[PDB]
Design an enzyme around this catalytic site. Sequence first.
Site, PDB file in Angstrom:
ATOM      1  N   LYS A   1      -4.538  -1.892 -46.579  1.00 35.10           N
ATOM      2  CA  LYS A   1      -4.568  -0.809 -45.603  1.00 35.10           C
ATOM      3  C   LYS A   1      -4.554   0.550 -46.288  1.00 35.10           C
ATOM      4  O   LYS A   1      -5.241   1.481 -45.853  1.00 35.10           O
ATOM      5  CB  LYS A   1      -3.386  -0.938 -44.644  1.00 35.10           C
TER       6      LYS A   1
ATOM      7  N   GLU B   1       8.672   6.124 -41.204  1.00 33.62           N
ATOM      8  CA  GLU B   1       8.127   5.533 -42.414  1.00 33.62           C
ATOM      9  C   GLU B   1       9.249   5.224 -43.394  1.00 33.62           C
ATOM     10  O   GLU B   1      10.148   6.043 -43.601  1.00 33.62           O
ATOM     11  CB  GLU B   1       7.125   6.488 -43.062  1.00 33.62           C
ATOM     12  N   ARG B   2       9.196   4.035 -43.989  1.00 34.71           N
ATOM     13  CA  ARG B   2      10.100   3.733 -45.087  1.00 34.71           C
ATOM     14  C   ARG B   2       9.861   4.731 -46.210  1.00 34.71           C
ATOM     15  O   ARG B   2       8.730   4.904 -46.671  1.00 34.71           O
ATOM     16  CB  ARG B   2       9.883   2.309 -45.593  1.00 34.71           C
TER      17      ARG B   2
END
Lengths: 166, 46, 50, 524, 488, 365
Positions: free
Chosen positions: F164, F190-191
Amino acid sequence: AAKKYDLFGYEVDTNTAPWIEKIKKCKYYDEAGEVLVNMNVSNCPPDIATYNATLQCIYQSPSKQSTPVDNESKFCAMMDLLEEMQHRNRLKPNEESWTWVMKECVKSGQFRLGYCIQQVMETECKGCPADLVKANEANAQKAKTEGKEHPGHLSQQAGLFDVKVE
Amino acid sequence: QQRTSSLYNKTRQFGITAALIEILSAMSSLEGNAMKGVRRNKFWEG
Amino acid sequence: ARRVAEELHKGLKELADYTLVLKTVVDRTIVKGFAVELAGQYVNKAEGQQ
Amino acid sequence: FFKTTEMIGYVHSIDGTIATLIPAPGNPGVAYNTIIQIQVSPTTFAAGLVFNLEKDGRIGIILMDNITEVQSGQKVMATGQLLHIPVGAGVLGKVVNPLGHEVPVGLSTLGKVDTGAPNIVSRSPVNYNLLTGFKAVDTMIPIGRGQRELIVGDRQTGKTSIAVSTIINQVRINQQILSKNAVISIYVSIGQRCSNVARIHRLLQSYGALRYTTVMAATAAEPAGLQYLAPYAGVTMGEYFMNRGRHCLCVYDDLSKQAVAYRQISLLLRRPPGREAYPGDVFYLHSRLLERAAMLSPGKGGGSVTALPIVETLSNDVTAYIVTNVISITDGQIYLDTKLFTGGQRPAVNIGLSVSRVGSSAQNAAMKGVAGKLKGILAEYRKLAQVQTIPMIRGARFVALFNQKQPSYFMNAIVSLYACLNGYLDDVKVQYVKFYEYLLVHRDLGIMYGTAKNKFFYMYVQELNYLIRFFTLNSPILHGELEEMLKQHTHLFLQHYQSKMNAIKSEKDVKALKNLLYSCKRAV
Amino acid sequence: VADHKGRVGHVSQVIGAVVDVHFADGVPPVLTALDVVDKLGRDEPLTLEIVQHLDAHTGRCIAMQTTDLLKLKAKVVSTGGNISVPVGRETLGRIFNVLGDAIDQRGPVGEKLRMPIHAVAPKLADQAAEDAVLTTGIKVIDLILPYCKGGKIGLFGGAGVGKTVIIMELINNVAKGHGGFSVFAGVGERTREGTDLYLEMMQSKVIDLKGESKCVLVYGQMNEPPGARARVAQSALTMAEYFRDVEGQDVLLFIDNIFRFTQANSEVSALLGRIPAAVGYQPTLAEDLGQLQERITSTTKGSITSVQAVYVPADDITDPAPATTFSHLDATTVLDRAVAESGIYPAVNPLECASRIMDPDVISVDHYNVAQDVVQMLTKYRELQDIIAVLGIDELSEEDKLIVDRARKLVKFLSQPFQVAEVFTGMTGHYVQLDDTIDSFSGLLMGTYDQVPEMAFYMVGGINSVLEKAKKMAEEAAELEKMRRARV
Amino acid sequence: PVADHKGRVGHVSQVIGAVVDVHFADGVPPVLTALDVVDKLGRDEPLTLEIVQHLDAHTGRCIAMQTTDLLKLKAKVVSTGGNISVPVGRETLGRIFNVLGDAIDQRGPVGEKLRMPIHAVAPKLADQAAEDAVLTTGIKVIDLILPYCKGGKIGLFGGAGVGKTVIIMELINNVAKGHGGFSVFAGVGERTREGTDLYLEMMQSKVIDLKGESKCVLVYGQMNEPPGARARVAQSALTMAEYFRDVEGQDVLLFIDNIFRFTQANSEVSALLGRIPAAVGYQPTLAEDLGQLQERITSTTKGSITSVQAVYVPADDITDPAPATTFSHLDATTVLDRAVAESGIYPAVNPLECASRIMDPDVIS
Ligand SMILES: Nc1ncnc2c1ncn2[C@@H]1O[C@H](COP(=O)(O)OP(=O)(O)OP(=O)(O)O)[C@@H](O)[C@H]1O
Ligand SMILES: Nc1ncnc2c1ncn2[C@@H]1O[C@H](COP(=O)(O)OP(=O)(O)OP(=O)(O)O)[C@@H](O)[C@H]1O
Ligand SMILES: [Mg+2]
Ligand SMILES: [Mg+2]
């Protein structure tokens, strides 16, 4: 003459003469439709005499509206009116009703439609007026002499990989 | 399998909807039954 | 504003015997003009930032 | 002579879209379901609807427009009237909002939006058909004027196209017949995307349907108040014609998003949630809407408002709360199965599940003859599904013919159905049915190959539509010529076209034939 | 304060269809009617019925019309009593609303008396003990779940499953030929359906406006506000009680749909300020139905045969509204959507149906024995169908296949074309006699008709119809084999 | 022009979790207005609040973008004169920002010339594009089977292990190469580990050239931030893209990762305010919240903004209200499968599982 009752049994006004006068005083035949609308809204169901006057207006009127309307047709307008009279109001068209249709076909020059109306009058009415039949044939011959018997875009021959599918 | 997974999803959605309502109907009782107004008392007498 | 208030007072029959007092308020929005409110009736003759 | 308004109070709380008003001591007061105007600026105003009058005088407003400019402490004026929107013929061809404001588009009668529905003795059975232009929906699922017909399906199954196209199919009819019988149309978009509205508007404008159509848009970005109120305003604009002996075609796209908006407003007001968190009166929300659509009695003029509500399901689930409620109000349903749509069978009308409860009485005599037999031919076809009996052959051809993109003129559709029903397409291969239909409608092989014997029954005479509609194709007047032209057309097609198509092997020719079929499938 | 005719109060809160009214002389008794005298630019009167007492002066009420343009501090005047409806033989042949007003636009009713909508139910000593069979003409209803004359009947069904069609079929078969009187109560149903019924009755001359009629039509439909839809059932039921008691006349009470009554009470309850029960219904769901249903009963004076349509939301037969209704029904008829999707009409699910007169002491022994046998095999087939789904028919025992074949024929046989669904079915309706059904099903169980094709039982009447459709099917096969020979 | 509420002073009336009530003597500013807690409090980061509701003519309820620890009552709060302002321009290329539009990359001042409010009304019906147009991504699979719609939304279904990140980077490079349009990436929930990896990778592919010209902006509202930030970071990124769409007339690419976390964040915020959740447990304004965001992503007469949003299906239930509501706004679908990747096919796209609405002769040739 006598009491006429609606779906549920309520009576309806039978004095359609005043509205027929209004129809006979219309210039464009789309105004006659408004009168018929007003008649129903006033609980005055149209009768055969009113329809004949309306069909006369569609034949004697210059156009549908003051401004031109695309794809307007007197024949289509009159036929729809007969359908309403026959299939919804359950009133059988008389000979006068079909005569107006035949007159328009002769006047417009749609001889192929005139053929069908001629058979229609003979089948249902007591024949067709001779003058209209002869006039309709005269229009057909002039088209035949002038090569307009059919639309010409159809005569041009085309095969499988020629048709444009448009 | 497709007919049972469809009901499982429909049952884990109805479950969360109907459980949060239960806990949020009690929150309204404990809150809507908190009487208020202008208390009429002999406040000086205290 | 006083003229407008008096005219509004005249229109109201129910305030026939009441005496018209005027109370000024600063409406932060309006930049020019004024407005008059009397017994519910409200006439605005003011404008805002164009 | 001043233009005095009526101040009632001041905005107090603004909880998103809902809000509250504190009364000004000793001020006039407000009524229920009336429209209030919050003064955002000395000259500009924002609309709100009264929803709750409280014991303490505090008013509960549902804000409609300019909700970002509403601030607490702003004065509120009262109109003292229920919401009346501009209606009539001067609003046709325009894009408006539920409040009646015109929406600019890139290049004086008033109607109440809270009017009750006609009563029992002020209605009548449906007798005038409303043609959708699709063979499947006009033969097997008849729709009459004054009927409520649901359109249920999954997302992107074509729910909008089948309805918007029906609004387009009326353009040709309205241009010919008297204007009294013209079907004016209203398209209410509720919660859709602004992009979709623009595409639909330009599609309607291309076919010149704006002269007989108006759009009422409430995009998703708009607050819930407008979405909750859009269909009521739309039907109100349609009720103008119904009460004057004319007909309307109000379409709602879609009621599912309206219910979501109403649920949002109810929850923000902290009301007891019901099944699936919907409010208890969600059924009443749609009840008071679809009931206003009717076929008025002859005494009341004979007008009509035809309703085409749209509903979205999930995974072809027709047992949802909202879906079932609407199905319990409408007079029939058109079901658009996802599998058929993804399988290339479009508009993908699942005739098995679709039904019309009151539409049979409206179907024209001409179509009622070709339909009753088509019912049996298709009924057997489903049960049977290699022995290929007569019912199987005709059933397969009918399914191929139902594939459409644009609405078909009545004469073209009925003639093709009659030909297939009488077995004229038995020799025609299934993949070539569309090309056969295109030649029958547009072209004329009898005139082409010098073998024409008919006098009037040619498919280029578009005026025969009203003779076919009056006498029925099985009439002594039109039946004889109809068979002759069909026989000539079938014989010529089998002799010239299908024979050559069966003798194509070259790869280039195969591509040429493949693309010919695609263009025919998309054009009649 | 015993009489409150003319007592004046003022509106104090308008939450919706729920309005609080403050009377300075004491809130009138509960269930009392009040009229909003103040004219506020409305087009219709506004009548509010008291439902609660909030204090010695304030009272909450529900409006029977829309509460639009209603302001606080609006004058309300007590009517001096509860909502009342015209009753008597003058009501016959007329259409009424919840308030007793005629909506048929014909003329004054001329009733000799008006009676309150709210009334006490019959006591224990007044209950009747007569058990007979109301022969409907529908095979499934007559055989497995026979209807009891003077007994409550319920038609549970989902949306678009056949509740209305069955009621119309019953009306055609029973009501038209019924000597006694009839009352049609419409509660939250389509207004078009009411229009069709009125026209249908006048064609059959069950409503002879120029003669004598035998049917009253009380209608509060979906468009009506929640207050009207709640009380319309009481108004209609009030007329039926009068005919039963004051005249000792048999009455047929057709209620469609009873569910909307519960829904209407639920909608107002959320506004009255009540903590909701499960799902969201009002806490008084059971009490409301009990008060209404108990009044629908046959006493020692007369008999009321009630047929009520019940709507099951989202096909959840466990939903509180339909679930509570089962205990108030002598006969139950559950309709299933899946059955309808299979082409079987009516969609009755016999396994989930029950009757009270399914007793040898009431019905004939042969009727009971045959009915029990059919249900036993329809129970065997359901169990076998679970094996059939995964593995297949070929994985069954030799006798099991025989049971499957007989059961499939039974399922097909139960279907019947109604005289009212000719348009949908495209076939002439059938009226099967009770004796014919019993004898016909007895043979199918015995195996006498094991040589008849399966589809010969689909959409037929008695066994005579079965044996004729079989003949036509066989003859039509000769047009498929003789033609085959001609082709060959 | 300046708004009258700039510099307006108020005092913190109530504090509960991330929700703070501020009292203004002269009147509460308009909703969505931004306020700064001037009080020192000995904190480590400044406290910003956003008005979300009006409780009365003087009191307003707000949500804190940072932690509300050490915040005492009666603390001074000063209005900023408008909604949250984010820098917009060509100076933001190759830079990382937060909800407040502050460079968190420690790479010097932004030096912007203009700022825009986070909340902007969507384009009017008159601004919509005349006709639908295709977006040539330069990828054979996408351009052929599932072509992109200029101004449309594309759901990029697929997780980690299918490439991705590379597909995202390739699209960013191709769009600038072909259409000359920039890109804005918005990491919502988001991490922080994966956000760092993306920045390092983008520097290696030179889509973020520190010594040259970059063609991508980053806006990271990571998980560690309170829900008040994760619900506005997407709008901030959208505002940056809108600037290029309108002022410059480009065809921008807006990546949102994910759109489900945007739904989750706005759901948590609604719960904090006390609003009754709808079915499943999402906020009652789920449809409106997405609509106010997606509708701003469209092709206008000036430019266009084609968005590629990564969609996550909770519990693998495609009928869940979150994905169900999201799918109503998606114009295309791009599905990535591990099986395709394991076969050596890159990009790992399942052609038969993808879909697109512009796959019609009326739009494409
Ligand atoms: N009869 C048809 N023939 C061919 N294509 C069709 C037909 N009907 C619809 N389509 C196409 O299918 C797609 C979906 O159509 P449409 O917008 O009507 O669906 P919908 O039910 O409104 O879905 P949505 O939830 O997006 O509103 C479009 O690309 C449209 O052009
Ligand atoms: N006995 C029957 N035979 C054939 N078709 C039937 C029969 N009963 C119902 N149907 C079909 O089902 C449709 C719906 O029937 P009906 O009007 O009885 O629904 P319902 O149970 O009243 O549902 P609702 O009132 O919620 O709309 C009919 O229009 C018809 O197509
Ligand atoms: Mg749609
Ligand atoms: Mg019904």
